[PDB]
DNA sequence: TAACAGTGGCCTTATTAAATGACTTCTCCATGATCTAC
């Protein structure tokens, strides 16, 4: 079997807000494989979010991310008139600094040719056949990614905080999200298992399927 | 050519170590019952 996709992720800020934080902007503290399945699907130009199902995300965390907390004044459809002062409400947003991780891609599940992970690759090989809008993020648009790169399984060659797939675990990270209310959203619950594995354990795949 | 290279005694006594008053002001609500227009 073809070897899965490794891809460095480095990210100087991320929010990766919240299911249910709507009143405030809590972030988990590793991306969702939803976020990074969104991701992915930006970077090789892929509008449909059904045409990748079945892609399978493994996430190794190089450092534990910093929290912090930003004011911000974030506007809202509340009235129907623009200038109205209740469409601006002040609330806090979590962010991440500093997010260094591997992502892990692996493609056997898929039905539909060619597959993410190849579409990735040849992405990666010729930069110049990519067609895509807008510039590549990490959770929120203004959030640009610094370093995305193809990488080895020892590319700091150091000690890797995966996340694995407890029924106990602490995290309950989402492989699909409905961003309308949350009927469709499909959750999963994680550990962070400090380990010096170069590879996925088993329990470290998440596949993201439809909510169907 | 020589032998000395200071012998003393002190090394601050007082007194006062802050007196005032202020210790954010506005605004941005969320949600369901009801009115109302299509």
């Known amino acids: 079997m073809i070897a899965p996709l490794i891809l460095y992720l480095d990210v100087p800020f991320t929010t990766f807000r919240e299911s249910h934080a709507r009143e405030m902007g809590k972030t988990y503290p590793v991306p969702p494989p939803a976020t990074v399945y969104g991701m992915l699907l930006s970077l090789v130009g892929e509008t449909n979010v059904y045409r990748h199902c079945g892609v399978e995300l493994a ?123 949350s009927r469709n959203t499909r959750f999963l619950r994680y550990r962070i298992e400090e380990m010096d594995r170069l590879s996925p354990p088993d329990l470290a795949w998440t596949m993201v399927q439809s909510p169907i």
């Open 59 to 181: 996430i190794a965390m190089l450092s534990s991310p910093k929290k912090s907390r930003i004011l911000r004044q974030m506007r809202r459809f509340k009235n129907a008139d623009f200038s109205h002062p209740e469409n601006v409400i002040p609330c806090y947003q979590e962010i991440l600094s500093n997010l260094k991780c591997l992502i892990w891609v692996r493609s056997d599940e898929e039905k539909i040719q060619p597959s993410l992970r190849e579409r990735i690759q040849l992405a990666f090989d010729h930069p110049e056949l990519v067609r895509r809008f807008g510039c590549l993020f990490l959770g929120e648009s203004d959030q640009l990614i610094k370093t995305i790169k193809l990488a080895r399984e020892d590319y700091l060659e150091g000690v890797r905080q995966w996340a694995i797939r407890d029924n106990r675990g602490r995290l309950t990270l989402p492989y699909w999200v409905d961003h309308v209310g």
